[model samples]
Target: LYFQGMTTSKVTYQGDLRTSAIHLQSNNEIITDAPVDNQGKGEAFSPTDLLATSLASCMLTIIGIKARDMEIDIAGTTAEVTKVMAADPRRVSEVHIAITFNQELDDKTQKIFYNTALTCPVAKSIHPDIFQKVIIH
Candidate 1:
């Protein structure tokens, strides 16, 4: 069960500012393209796009695990992510996550879920300079 040195994914640079990556464990593939503003086609998710979306995805996953432990069903929850870029450093300046739930929950449950998401691995790992805004809807 130890995965200390496991190869999680492999990425190859394809011509024209694109890259293809494969998850070794699941055999799932992902393609990334540079944004059109960055002098490339905006055909697929860019690297920064992945980073931004990963935050939302990780938040939902963490919340899902917590919900399961609490015997709560949150099957229809969804999240929308937005990434804003900074020019001086050419880096992600902000990420906005709007999460919507299918049904109304009690205040305590909602608070717990929101708190859990704020502390998710990806949220914690991101640089402090990157503003993370999470909205529960």
Candidate 2:
């Protein structure tokens, strides 16, 4: 709705602190549950969990696009995401992301990868107050 474009996805609350999201185009779905700290089963990804996970996913997506365009091999890359919550407003306070690559990359290519990760759409869209601690190696 923000872009004046057609809706990309749809979300529904299924009661009991759970919700389902569907991608309109691919018909893919994702389910989210409240975390144990929020008085619900931690059996599935929480809303906050998805937000944190998205940062990594978006980064990889950007890197994948760039890798293909630049003809770089970045197949064996992995990212670890950690989320920290804060009080008062009770929201995500910080996101720590560590990315590692399995292939041996030259200095220029490595820098490109690192820079591309930082330029992810989610990385730029999140609130500026949220701290982003990133490590690439």
Q: Which of the numbered candidates is closest to the native, going by highest TM-score? A: 1
lDDT of 2 at 66: 87
RMSD of 2: 2.3
Off by over 4 Å in 1: 1-4
Please give the CA lDDT of all the candidate structures.
Answer: 0.93, 0.87
lDDT of 1 by residue, 1-137 (tens): 76679788999999889999999989999999997886877799999999999999999999999999999889989999999989876989999999999888889999999999999999999989999999999
**Count of backbone clashes for each model?**
0, 0
Q: Which of the numbered candidates is closest to the native, going by highest lDDT?
A: 1
> Backbone clash tally for model 2?
0
Q: Estimate each model's TM-score.
A: 0.93, 0.90
Q: Write candidate 2's Cα lDDT for 30-134 as tens digits.
A: 999897776776778888889999999998889889889998778889999999999898899999989897777788877887898888899998888899887
Global CA lDDT computed for model 2: 0.87
